[PDB]
Amino acid sequence: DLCFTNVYADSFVIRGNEVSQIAPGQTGNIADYNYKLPDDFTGCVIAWNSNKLDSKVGGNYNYRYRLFRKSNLKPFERDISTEIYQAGNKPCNGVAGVNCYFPLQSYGFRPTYGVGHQPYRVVVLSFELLHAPATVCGPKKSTNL
Amino acid sequence: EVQLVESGGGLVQPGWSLRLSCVVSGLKFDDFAMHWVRQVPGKGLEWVSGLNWNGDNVAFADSVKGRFTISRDNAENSLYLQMNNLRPEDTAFYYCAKDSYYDILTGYSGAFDMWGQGTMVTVSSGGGGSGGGGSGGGGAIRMTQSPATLSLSPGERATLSCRASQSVHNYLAWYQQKPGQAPRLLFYDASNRATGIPARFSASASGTDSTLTISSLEPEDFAVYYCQQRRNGYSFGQGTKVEIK
């Protein structure tokens, strides 16, 4: 019966290790450097083991993760970019070298991973209540005649 | 090279507050996380705490949670620890460790790539204290080393196997500690060679099993070797003390 204005859907896959990090205001790489779920929020996150469809023996390089960042991404902040990351002194002119690693890294999946390393399809549904009329409503049956 | 100088140790009466410092030098410290680790005299390593390069990642030991404060400054390249309500079990040898960042989803990795000299803090002048709460952090199934203790002569090959209770993927660290001397890093990720490592030192790992081979032993290569894990609130292994037979 609660009808809201807007809804946003995000979908991806991560490792089964970090499942506990998905919560409003957590400490960890995923909780800050990809998305931070706000401490107050309407909506939530659903995750389920999409291992056998998204894990390859040779390494499912199709699924990749943006890894490095100097800052924590705020709630409803989107950072999608393609830049090589500098850690020690220099970004090593866009190669693989001494202490110079690339954030957009493929996971290197293996279905031979244990239960902890079983990747999860992770989706977040986000509610937005704006001054506009709430049109994304739920059905109004109506009863019989 | 990175020089890590620690200060603040000595003998103190328990119960008051103390400050420990680790000053960093050698390169851009702002991009690297700093960490405290503990040494109980005559036994294995225990982790203390860790602070990220930006300070976003805060990690405290369960025993010291809620009473000890960490801080850092990337302009002067320093890490500070402020401790209160001291008890005699806190007497130890502390080490500050620089960041050795890794690349998987769970976050950055702080380990022993750049060492501090380690400083002794002895809060033992009054009566001893302890508690009856063991919890489950010390009873966890330790990564089994086969053999647990290996005493071999120079010249032959030594094999040490670290078998882990839970799946640690590829993140296991192989470490060397010279008795009375600054400990030395051996193997990143337990599977690839560290830079400048001679051919006689080799290691491999996948899942829960790791093998370390040291061919053609030398009289100076007897030390304490560690296989170390990093799942959540990372702890150290029991260590293997390889000395002369």
mmCIF file of C-alpha atoms in Angstrom:
data_model
loop_
_atom_site.group_PDB
_atom_site.id
_atom_site.type_symbol
_atom_site.label_atom_id
_atom_site.label_comp_id
_atom_site.label_asym_id
_atom_site.label_seq_id
_atom_site.Cartn_x
_atom_site.Cartn_y
_atom_site.Cartn_z
ATOM 1 C CA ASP A 1 0.000 0.000 0.000
ATOM 2 C CA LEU A 2 2.950 2.323 0.570
ATOM 3 C CA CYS A 3 3.479 4.003 -2.797
ATOM 4 C CA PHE A 4 6.761 5.835 -3.333
ATOM 5 C CA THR A 5 8.109 8.086 -6.054
ATOM 6 C CA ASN A 6 11.281 6.503 -7.445
ATOM 7 C CA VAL A 7 13.145 3.208 -7.173
ATOM 8 C CA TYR A 8 16.762 2.483 -8.128
ATOM 9 C CA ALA A 9 18.156 -1.004 -8.768
ATOM 10 C CA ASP A 10 21.842 -1.939 -8.684
ATOM 11 C CA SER A 11 23.138 -5.422 -9.483
ATOM 12 C CA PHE A 12 26.598 -7.012 -9.474
ATOM 13 C CA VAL A 13 28.599 -9.951 -8.075
ATOM 14 C CA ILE A 14 31.187 -10.005 -5.292
ATOM 15 C CA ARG A 15 32.973 -12.673 -3.228
ATOM 16 C CA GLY A 16 31.311 -14.618 -0.442
ATOM 17 C CA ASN A 17 33.980 -13.414 1.984
ATOM 18 C CA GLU A 18 32.624 -9.860 2.282
ATOM 19 C CA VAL A 19 28.932 -10.728 2.713
ATOM 20 C CA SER A 20 28.955 -9.401 6.276
ATOM 21 C CA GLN A 21 30.266 -5.999 5.138
ATOM 22 C CA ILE A 22 26.958 -5.027 3.522
ATOM 23 C CA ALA A 23 25.342 -2.869 6.213
ATOM 24 C CA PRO A 24 24.761 0.854 6.851
ATOM 25 C CA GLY A 25 28.149 2.260 7.771
ATOM 26 C CA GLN A 26 30.620 -0.630 7.744
ATOM 27 C CA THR A 27 34.411 -0.789 7.753
ATOM 28 C CA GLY A 28 36.050 -2.375 4.734
ATOM 29 C CA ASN A 29 37.043 -1.935 1.121
ATOM 30 C CA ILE A 30 33.650 -2.702 -0.407
ATOM 31 C CA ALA A 31 31.673 -0.748 2.189
ATOM 32 C CA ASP A 32 33.464 2.490 1.286
ATOM 33 C CA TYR A 33 35.336 2.358 -2.031
ATOM 34 C CA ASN A 34 32.455 1.043 -4.165
ATOM 35 C CA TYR A 35 29.381 2.122 -2.200
ATOM 36 C CA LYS A 36 28.525 3.131 1.362
ATOM 37 C CA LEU A 37 24.966 2.361 2.387
ATOM 38 C CA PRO A 38 23.665 5.324 4.423
ATOM 39 C CA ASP A 39 23.108 4.826 8.135
ATOM 40 C CA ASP A 40 19.483 5.865 7.593
ATOM 41 C CA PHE A 41 17.953 4.226 4.537
ATOM 42 C CA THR A 42 14.643 3.071 3.062
ATOM 43 C CA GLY A 43 15.215 0.020 0.907
ATOM 44 C CA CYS A 44 17.775 -2.714 1.307
ATOM 45 C CA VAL A 45 20.084 -5.302 -0.268
ATOM 46 C CA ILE A 46 19.492 -8.912 -1.341
ATOM 47 C CA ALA A 47 22.389 -11.284 -2.041
ATOM 48 C CA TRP A 48 22.404 -14.916 -3.144
ATOM 49 C CA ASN A 49 25.059 -17.396 -4.209
ATOM 50 C CA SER A 50 25.466 -16.933 -7.963
ATOM 51 C CA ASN A 51 28.525 -19.170 -7.981
ATOM 52 C CA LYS A 52 27.831 -21.893 -10.553
ATOM 53 C CA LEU A 53 26.669 -19.305 -13.098
ATOM 54 C CA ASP A 54 29.355 -16.659 -12.471
ATOM 55 C CA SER A 55 32.456 -18.713 -11.558
ATOM 56 C CA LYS A 56 34.874 -20.173 -14.115
ATOM 57 C CA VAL A 57 37.551 -22.781 -13.448
ATOM 58 C CA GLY A 58 40.086 -20.815 -15.457
ATOM 59 C CA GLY A 59 38.993 -17.677 -13.647
ATOM 60 C CA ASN A 60 35.859 -15.720 -14.456
ATOM 61 C CA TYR A 61 37.583 -12.581 -15.699
ATOM 62 C CA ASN A 62 34.261 -11.371 -17.127
ATOM 63 C CA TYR A 63 33.266 -10.201 -13.651
ATOM 64 C CA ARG A 64 35.657 -7.510 -12.421
ATOM 65 C CA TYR A 65 35.891 -5.200 -9.428
ATOM 66 C CA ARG A 66 37.098 -1.650 -9.006
ATOM 67 C CA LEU A 67 39.481 -2.034 -6.092
ATOM 68 C CA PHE A 68 41.576 0.987 -5.105
ATOM 69 C CA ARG A 69 40.497 4.454 -3.975
ATOM 70 C CA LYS A 70 41.915 7.218 -1.801
ATOM 71 C CA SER A 71 38.442 8.116 -0.501
ATOM 72 C CA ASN A 72 35.263 6.551 0.818
ATOM 73 C CA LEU A 73 32.344 6.804 -1.603
ATOM 74 C CA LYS A 74 29.357 8.426 0.078
ATOM 75 C CA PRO A 75 25.807 7.042 -0.036
ATOM 76 C CA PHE A 76 24.275 7.581 -3.478
ATOM 77 C CA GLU A 77 27.713 8.395 -4.889
ATOM 78 C CA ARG A 78 28.669 6.677 -8.143
ATOM 79 C CA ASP A 79 32.310 6.174 -9.137
ATOM 80 C CA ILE A 80 32.736 4.310 -12.431
ATOM 81 C CA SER A 81 36.108 5.022 -14.034
ATOM 82 C CA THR A 82 39.085 3.442 -15.804
ATOM 83 C CA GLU A 83 42.333 4.668 -14.236
ATOM 84 C CA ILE A 84 45.437 2.809 -13.084
ATOM 85 C CA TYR A 85 46.239 3.342 -9.422
ATOM 86 C CA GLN A 86 49.466 4.552 -7.826
ATOM 87 C CA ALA A 87 50.414 3.222 -4.400
ATOM 88 C CA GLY A 88 54.135 3.608 -3.710
ATOM 89 C CA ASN A 89 55.296 6.628 -5.674
ATOM 90 C CA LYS A 90 54.060 6.519 -9.288
ATOM 91 C CA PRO A 91 51.309 4.888 -11.369
ATOM 92 C CA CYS A 92 54.137 3.179 -13.324
ATOM 93 C CA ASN A 93 52.884 4.690 -16.618
ATOM 94 C CA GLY A 94 50.000 2.243 -16.919
ATOM 95 C CA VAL A 95 51.745 -1.141 -16.671
ATOM 96 C CA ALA A 96 52.202 -3.918 -14.112
ATOM 97 C CA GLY A 97 55.365 -3.375 -12.104
ATOM 98 C CA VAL A 98 56.963 -2.753 -8.716
ATOM 99 C CA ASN A 99 54.186 -2.149 -6.153
ATOM 100 C CA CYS A 100 51.943 -0.873 -8.971
ATOM 101 C CA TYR A 101 48.621 -2.703 -9.294
ATOM 102 C CA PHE A 102 45.452 -1.975 -11.233
ATOM 103 C CA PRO A 103 42.130 -1.375 -9.422
ATOM 104 C CA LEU A 104 39.779 -2.725 -12.113
ATOM 105 C CA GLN A 105 40.936 -6.244 -11.353
ATOM 106 C CA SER A 106 39.270 -9.451 -12.410
ATOM 107 C CA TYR A 107 38.413 -11.627 -9.428
ATOM 108 C CA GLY A 108 40.111 -14.815 -10.587
ATOM 109 C CA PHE A 109 37.186 -17.006 -9.620
ATOM 110 C CA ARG A 110 37.339 -20.769 -9.198
ATOM 111 C CA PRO A 111 34.320 -23.031 -8.578
ATOM 112 C CA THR A 112 36.800 -25.052 -6.511
ATOM 113 C CA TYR A 113 36.600 -22.230 -3.954
ATOM 114 C CA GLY A 114 35.293 -23.129 -0.529
ATOM 115 C CA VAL A 115 32.019 -21.904 0.891
ATOM 116 C CA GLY A 116 33.659 -18.663 2.022
ATOM 117 C CA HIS A 117 34.947 -17.830 -1.465
ATOM 118 C CA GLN A 118 31.642 -18.554 -3.203
ATOM 119 C CA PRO A 119 30.657 -15.353 -5.051
ATOM 120 C CA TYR A 120 27.233 -13.819 -4.493
ATOM 121 C CA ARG A 121 24.958 -11.985 -6.867
ATOM 122 C CA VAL A 122 24.355 -8.806 -4.868
ATOM 123 C CA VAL A 123 21.571 -6.368 -5.715
ATOM 124 C CA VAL A 124 20.417 -3.263 -3.858
ATOM 125 C CA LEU A 125 16.960 -1.735 -4.143
ATOM 126 C CA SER A 126 16.788 1.922 -3.123
ATOM 127 C CA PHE A 127 13.652 3.913 -2.305
ATOM 128 C CA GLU A 128 13.223 7.582 -3.184
ATOM 129 C CA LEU A 129 10.375 9.761 -1.901
ATOM 130 C CA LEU A 130 10.148 13.027 -3.832
ATOM 131 C CA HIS A 131 7.613 15.845 -4.021
ATOM 132 C CA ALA A 132 6.403 14.365 -7.307
ATOM 133 C CA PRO A 133 3.245 12.224 -7.118
ATOM 134 C CA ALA A 134 4.003 8.703 -5.974
ATOM 135 C CA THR A 135 3.153 6.563 -8.996
ATOM 136 C CA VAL A 136 5.118 3.356 -8.346
ATOM 137 C CA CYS A 137 2.329 1.964 -6.166
ATOM 138 C CA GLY A 138 1.239 -1.402 -4.827
ATOM 139 C CA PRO A 139 -2.034 -2.706 -7.222
ATOM 140 C CA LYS A 140 -5.212 -1.441 -5.502
ATOM 141 C CA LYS A 141 -7.332 -4.540 -6.227
ATOM 142 C CA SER A 142 -9.614 -4.261 -6.140
ATOM 143 C CA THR A 143 -12.185 -6.606 -4.627
ATOM 144 C CA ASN A 144 -14.896 -8.563 -6.423
ATOM 145 C CA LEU A 145 -18.315 -7.309 -7.482
ATOM 146 C CA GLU B 1 64.566 2.547 2.276
ATOM 147 C CA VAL B 2 61.813 2.917 4.881
ATOM 148 C CA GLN B 3 63.168 3.378 8.402
ATOM 149 C CA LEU B 4 60.631 2.829 11.184
ATOM 150 C CA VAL B 5 61.732 4.162 14.574
ATOM 151 C CA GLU B 6 59.624 3.313 17.629
ATOM 152 C CA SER B 7 59.624 5.012 21.017
ATOM 153 C CA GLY B 8 57.754 5.115 24.301
ATOM 154 C CA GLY B 9 58.826 1.859 25.956
ATOM 155 C CA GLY B 10 60.187 1.215 29.430
ATOM 156 C CA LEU B 11 58.995 0.002 32.825
ATOM 157 C CA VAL B 12 55.787 1.560 34.163
ATOM 158 C CA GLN B 13 53.366 0.921 37.009
ATOM 159 C CA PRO B 14 50.098 -0.391 35.547
ATOM 160 C CA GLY B 15 46.846 1.568 35.633
ATOM 161 C CA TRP B 16 47.820 4.902 34.061
ATOM 162 C CA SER B 17 48.104 6.023 30.446
ATOM 163 C CA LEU B 18 51.030 5.726 28.048
ATOM 164 C CA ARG B 19 51.856 6.950 24.544
ATOM 165 C CA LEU B 20 53.798 4.949 21.964
ATOM 166 C CA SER B 21 55.132 6.447 18.739
ATOM 167 C CA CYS B 22 56.393 5.048 15.437
ATOM 168 C CA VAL B 23 58.003 7.595 13.104
ATOM 169 C CA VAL B 24 58.166 6.595 9.432
ATOM 170 C CA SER B 25 60.768 7.532 6.830
ATOM 171 C CA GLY B 26 61.953 6.434 3.408
ATOM 172 C CA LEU B 27 59.054 7.231 1.057
ATOM 173 C CA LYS B 28 55.518 8.616 0.831
ATOM 174 C CA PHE B 29 53.994 7.303 4.055
ATOM 175 C CA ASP B 30 50.606 8.901 3.345
ATOM 176 C CA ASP B 31 49.726 6.149 0.867
ATOM 177 C CA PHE B 32 50.420 3.328 3.347
ATOM 178 C CA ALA B 33 48.531 2.032 6.373
ATOM 179 C CA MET B 34 50.317 1.575 9.692
ATOM 180 C CA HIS B 35 49.878 -1.195 12.242
ATOM 181 C CA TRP B 36 50.763 -2.311 15.771
ATOM 182 C CA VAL B 37 51.694 -5.940 16.456
ATOM 183 C CA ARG B 38 52.637 -7.624 19.741
ATOM 184 C CA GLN B 39 55.400 -10.010 20.832
ATOM 185 C CA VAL B 40 54.990 -11.936 24.062
ATOM 186 C CA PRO B 41 58.540 -12.698 25.316
ATOM 187 C CA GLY B 42 59.548 -16.186 24.221
ATOM 188 C CA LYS B 43 56.404 -17.155 22.281
ATOM 189 C CA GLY B 44 54.514 -16.488 19.079
ATOM 190 C CA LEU B 45 53.296 -13.244 17.559
ATOM 191 C CA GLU B 46 49.961 -11.621 18.411
ATOM 192 C CA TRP B 47 48.349 -8.736 16.529
ATOM 193 C CA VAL B 48 47.490 -5.435 18.247
ATOM 194 C CA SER B 49 45.760 -2.995 15.901
ATOM 195 C CA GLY B 50 45.710 -1.321 12.516
ATOM 196 C CA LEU B 51 44.945 2.089 11.003
ATOM 197 C CA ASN B 52 44.485 2.733 7.278
ATOM 198 C CA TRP B 53 46.372 5.309 5.198
ATOM 199 C CA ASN B 54 43.333 7.600 5.330
ATOM 200 C CA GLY B 55 42.303 6.257 8.750
ATOM 201 C CA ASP B 56 39.037 4.900 7.350
ATOM 202 C CA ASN B 57 39.900 1.307 8.304
ATOM 203 C CA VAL B 58 40.107 1.037 12.094
ATOM 204 C CA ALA B 59 40.979 -2.312 13.646
ATOM 205 C CA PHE B 60 41.430 -3.027 17.347
ATOM 206 C CA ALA B 61 42.153 -6.187 19.299
ATOM 207 C CA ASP B 62 39.182 -7.584 21.214
ATOM 208 C CA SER B 63 41.023 -7.426 24.545
ATOM 209 C CA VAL B 64 41.952 -3.758 24.057
ATOM 210 C CA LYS B 65 38.736 -2.735 22.280
ATOM 211 C CA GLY B 66 37.063 0.270 23.872
ATOM 212 C CA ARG B 67 40.032 1.384 25.985
ATOM 213 C CA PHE B 68 43.015 1.999 23.651
ATOM 214 C CA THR B 69 43.117 4.758 21.024
ATOM 215 C CA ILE B 70 45.030 4.760 17.734
ATOM 216 C CA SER B 71 45.976 7.813 15.677
ATOM 217 C CA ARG B 72 48.267 8.784 12.823
ATOM 218 C CA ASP B 73 49.764 11.747 10.983
ATOM 219 C CA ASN B 74 50.816 11.410 7.338
ATOM 220 C CA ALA B 75 52.564 14.800 7.253
ATOM 221 C CA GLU B 76 55.112 14.005 9.976
ATOM 222 C CA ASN B 77 54.877 10.261 9.158
ATOM 223 C CA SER B 78 53.978 9.071 12.657
ATOM 224 C CA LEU B 79 51.642 6.562 14.295
ATOM 225 C CA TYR B 80 50.499 7.094 17.890
ATOM 226 C CA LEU B 81 48.955 4.730 20.429
ATOM 227 C CA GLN B 82 47.391 5.940 23.678
ATOM 228 C CA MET B 83 46.679 3.266 26.294
ATOM 229 C CA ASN B 84 44.888 3.363 29.656
ATOM 230 C CA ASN B 85 43.872 1.022 32.522
ATOM 231 C CA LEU B 86 47.090 -0.965 32.188
ATOM 232 C CA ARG B 87 47.344 -4.515 33.531
ATOM 233 C CA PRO B 88 50.417 -6.777 33.900
ATOM 234 C CA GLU B 89 49.512 -8.923 30.882
ATOM 235 C CA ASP B 90 50.261 -5.926 28.623
ATOM 236 C CA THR B 91 54.037 -6.335 29.100
ATOM 237 C CA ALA B 92 55.328 -7.140 25.617
ATOM 238 C CA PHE B 93 57.481 -6.147 22.661
ATOM 239 C CA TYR B 94 55.597 -3.923 20.235
ATOM 240 C CA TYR B 95 56.317 -3.536 16.523
ATOM 241 C CA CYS B 96 55.050 -1.002 14.015
ATOM 242 C CA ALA B 97 54.481 -2.405 10.545
ATOM 243 C CA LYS B 98 54.023 -0.579 7.262
ATOM 244 C CA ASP B 99 51.352 -1.462 4.709
ATOM 245 C CA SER B 100 51.851 -4.228 2.157
ATOM 246 C CA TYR B 101 48.657 -3.789 0.154
ATOM 247 C CA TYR B 102 46.991 -6.765 -1.544
ATOM 248 C CA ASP B 103 44.279 -7.093 -4.181
ATOM 249 C CA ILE B 104 41.056 -8.949 -3.372
ATOM 250 C CA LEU B 105 37.563 -7.761 -2.404
ATOM 251 C CA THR B 106 37.875 -7.874 1.401
ATOM 252 C CA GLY B 107 40.046 -4.748 1.572
ATOM 253 C CA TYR B 108 43.634 -3.598 1.971
ATOM 254 C CA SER B 109 46.251 -5.751 3.679
ATOM 255 C CA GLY B 110 48.649 -4.620 6.392
ATOM 256 C CA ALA B 111 51.517 -6.992 7.056
ATOM 257 C CA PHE B 112 55.260 -7.140 7.777
ATOM 258 C CA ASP B 113 56.915 -5.722 4.696
ATOM 259 C CA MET B 114 58.533 -2.726 6.433
ATOM 260 C CA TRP B 115 59.562 -3.331 10.049
ATOM 261 C CA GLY B 116 60.111 -1.216 13.099
ATOM 262 C CA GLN B 117 62.852 -2.045 15.563
ATOM 263 C CA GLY B 118 60.297 -2.967 18.235
ATOM 264 C CA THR B 119 60.217 -1.477 21.731
ATOM 265 C CA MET B 120 59.668 -3.156 25.082
ATOM 266 C CA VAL B 121 56.833 -2.040 27.353
ATOM 267 C CA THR B 122 56.916 -3.639 30.807
ATOM 268 C CA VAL B 123 53.939 -2.772 32.974
ATOM 269 C CA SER B 124 55.071 -5.063 35.793
ATOM 270 C CA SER B 125 55.950 -3.415 39.099
ATOM 271 C CA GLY B 126 52.829 -4.261 41.101
ATOM 272 C CA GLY B 127 50.666 -7.338 41.465
ATOM 273 C CA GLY B 128 49.736 -9.587 38.579
ATOM 274 C CA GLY B 129 46.283 -9.616 37.043
ATOM 275 C CA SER B 130 44.226 -11.739 34.682
ATOM 276 C CA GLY B 131 40.701 -12.937 33.983
ATOM 277 C CA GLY B 132 38.707 -16.116 33.602
ATOM 278 C CA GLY B 133 37.198 -15.289 30.222
ATOM 279 C CA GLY B 134 38.912 -17.185 27.422
ATOM 280 C CA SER B 135 36.276 -16.616 24.710
ATOM 281 C CA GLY B 136 37.175 -18.222 21.379
ATOM 282 C CA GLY B 137 39.896 -16.054 19.846
ATOM 283 C CA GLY B 138 42.734 -18.024 21.425
ATOM 284 C CA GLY B 139 41.216 -21.487 21.003
ATOM 285 C CA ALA B 140 40.761 -21.195 17.241
ATOM 286 C CA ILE B 141 42.242 -24.039 15.205
ATOM 287 C CA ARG B 142 45.776 -22.819 14.491
ATOM 288 C CA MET B 143 47.351 -23.414 11.082
ATOM 289 C CA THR B 144 49.218 -26.688 11.585
ATOM 290 C CA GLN B 145 52.914 -26.713 10.709
ATOM 291 C CA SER B 146 54.534 -29.987 9.692
ATOM 292 C CA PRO B 147 56.940 -30.423 11.188
ATOM 293 C CA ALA B 148 56.078 -28.223 14.172
ATOM 294 C CA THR B 149 59.784 -27.976 15.045
ATOM 295 C CA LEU B 150 62.528 -28.782 12.537
ATOM 296 C CA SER B 151 66.210 -28.803 13.516
ATOM 297 C CA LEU B 152 68.447 -29.322 10.481
ATOM 298 C CA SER B 153 72.089 -28.737 9.581
ATOM 299 C CA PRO B 154 73.345 -26.434 6.811
ATOM 300 C CA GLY B 155 73.435 -27.945 3.339
ATOM 301 C CA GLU B 156 70.257 -29.994 2.918
ATOM 302 C CA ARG B 157 66.659 -29.050 2.072
ATOM 303 C CA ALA B 158 64.027 -28.094 4.651
ATOM 304 C CA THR B 159 60.300 -28.416 3.902
ATOM 305 C CA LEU B 160 57.658 -26.767 6.088
ATOM 306 C CA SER B 161 53.952 -27.257 5.402
ATOM 307 C CA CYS B 162 51.290 -24.875 6.698
ATOM 308 C CA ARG B 163 47.798 -26.393 6.639
ATOM 309 C CA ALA B 164 44.973 -23.961 7.369
ATOM 310 C CA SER B 165 41.662 -24.643 9.090
ATOM 311 C CA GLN B 166 39.588 -22.363 6.845
ATOM 312 C CA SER B 167 39.919 -21.336 3.215
ATOM 313 C CA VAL B 168 42.378 -18.433 3.142
ATOM 314 C CA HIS B 169 42.318 -18.255 -0.683
ATOM 315 C CA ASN B 170 45.845 -17.186 -1.690
ATOM 316 C CA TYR B 171 46.639 -14.809 1.191
ATOM 317 C CA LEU B 172 49.164 -16.475 3.484
ATOM 318 C CA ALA B 173 52.392 -14.778 4.536
ATOM 319 C CA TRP B 174 55.674 -16.580 5.148
ATOM 320 C CA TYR B 175 57.920 -14.795 7.617
ATOM 321 C CA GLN B 176 61.417 -15.125 9.086
ATOM 322 C CA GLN B 177 62.516 -13.882 12.519
ATOM 323 C CA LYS B 178 66.179 -13.966 13.499
ATOM 324 C CA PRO B 179 66.608 -14.470 17.267
ATOM 325 C CA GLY B 180 67.700 -11.122 18.689
ATOM 326 C CA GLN B 181 67.717 -9.517 15.223
ATOM 327 C CA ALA B 182 65.168 -7.713 13.078
ATOM 328 C CA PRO B 183 62.815 -10.281 11.489
ATOM 329 C CA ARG B 184 62.806 -10.615 7.700
ATOM 330 C CA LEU B 185 59.941 -10.993 5.238
ATOM 331 C CA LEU B 186 60.113 -14.186 3.170
ATOM 332 C CA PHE B 187 57.069 -14.759 0.957
ATOM 333 C CA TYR B 188 54.123 -12.649 -0.178
ATOM 334 C CA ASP B 189 50.827 -14.512 -0.615
ATOM 335 C CA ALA B 190 52.772 -17.723 0.124
ATOM 336 C CA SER B 191 52.734 -18.375 -3.627
ATOM 337 C CA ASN B 192 54.946 -15.771 -5.331
ATOM 338 C CA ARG B 193 58.538 -14.795 -4.614
ATOM 339 C CA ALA B 194 59.481 -11.553 -2.922
ATOM 340 C CA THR B 195 61.877 -9.268 -4.773
ATOM 341 C CA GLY B 196 65.549 -10.155 -4.400
ATOM 342 C CA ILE B 197 64.860 -13.581 -2.863
ATOM 343 C CA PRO B 198 67.509 -16.158 -3.873
ATOM 344 C CA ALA B 199 66.553 -19.298 -5.767
ATOM 345 C CA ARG B 200 66.989 -21.623 -2.771
ATOM 346 C CA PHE B 201 63.972 -20.075 -1.017
ATOM 347 C CA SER B 202 60.693 -21.117 -2.633
ATOM 348 C CA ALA B 203 57.066 -21.311 -1.532
ATOM 349 C CA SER B 204 53.691 -22.252 -2.976
ATOM 350 C CA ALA B 205 50.115 -22.163 -1.707
ATOM 351 C CA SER B 206 46.468 -22.604 -2.712
ATOM 352 C CA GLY B 207 43.368 -22.972 -0.572
ATOM 353 C CA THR B 208 44.502 -24.267 2.821
ATOM 354 C CA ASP B 209 47.815 -26.044 2.049
ATOM 355 C CA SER B 210 51.148 -24.238 1.673
ATOM 356 C CA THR B 211 54.678 -25.571 1.202
ATOM 357 C CA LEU B 212 57.958 -23.778 1.925
ATOM 358 C CA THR B 213 61.250 -25.233 0.677
ATOM 359 C CA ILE B 214 64.713 -24.012 1.690
ATOM 360 C CA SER B 215 67.331 -25.900 -0.316
ATOM 361 C CA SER B 216 71.047 -25.909 0.557
ATOM 362 C CA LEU B 217 70.791 -24.612 4.131
ATOM 363 C CA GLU B 218 73.405 -22.218 5.562
ATOM 364 C CA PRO B 219 74.657 -21.722 9.142
ATOM 365 C CA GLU B 220 72.972 -18.305 9.406
ATOM 366 C CA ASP B 221 69.520 -19.244 8.051
ATOM 367 C CA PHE B 222 68.190 -20.729 11.312
ATOM 368 C CA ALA B 223 65.346 -18.568 12.618
ATOM 369 C CA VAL B 224 61.655 -18.644 13.445
ATOM 370 C CA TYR B 225 59.388 -19.090 10.428
ATOM 371 C CA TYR B 226 55.720 -18.090 10.449
ATOM 372 C CA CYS B 227 52.732 -18.728 8.238
ATOM 373 C CA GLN B 228 50.264 -15.924 8.855
ATOM 374 C CA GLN B 229 46.597 -15.505 7.923
ATOM 375 C CA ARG B 230 44.333 -12.505 7.370
ATOM 376 C CA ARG B 231 40.624 -13.459 7.299
ATOM 377 C CA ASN B 232 39.105 -11.050 9.879
ATOM 378 C CA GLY B 233 40.936 -9.658 12.887
ATOM 379 C CA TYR B 234 44.046 -11.367 11.573
ATOM 380 C CA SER B 235 46.154 -13.488 13.921
ATOM 381 C CA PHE B 236 49.492 -15.251 13.622
ATOM 382 C CA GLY B 237 50.522 -18.878 13.669
ATOM 383 C CA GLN B 238 52.383 -20.769 16.364
ATOM 384 C CA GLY B 239 55.698 -20.352 14.530
ATOM 385 C CA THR B 240 58.394 -22.935 13.887
ATOM 386 C CA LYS B 241 61.759 -22.431 15.591
ATOM 387 C CA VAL B 242 64.334 -23.905 13.198
ATOM 388 C CA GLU B 243 67.805 -23.949 14.763
ATOM 389 C CA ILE B 244 70.896 -26.134 14.542
ATOM 390 C CA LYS B 245 70.207 -29.802 15.251
#
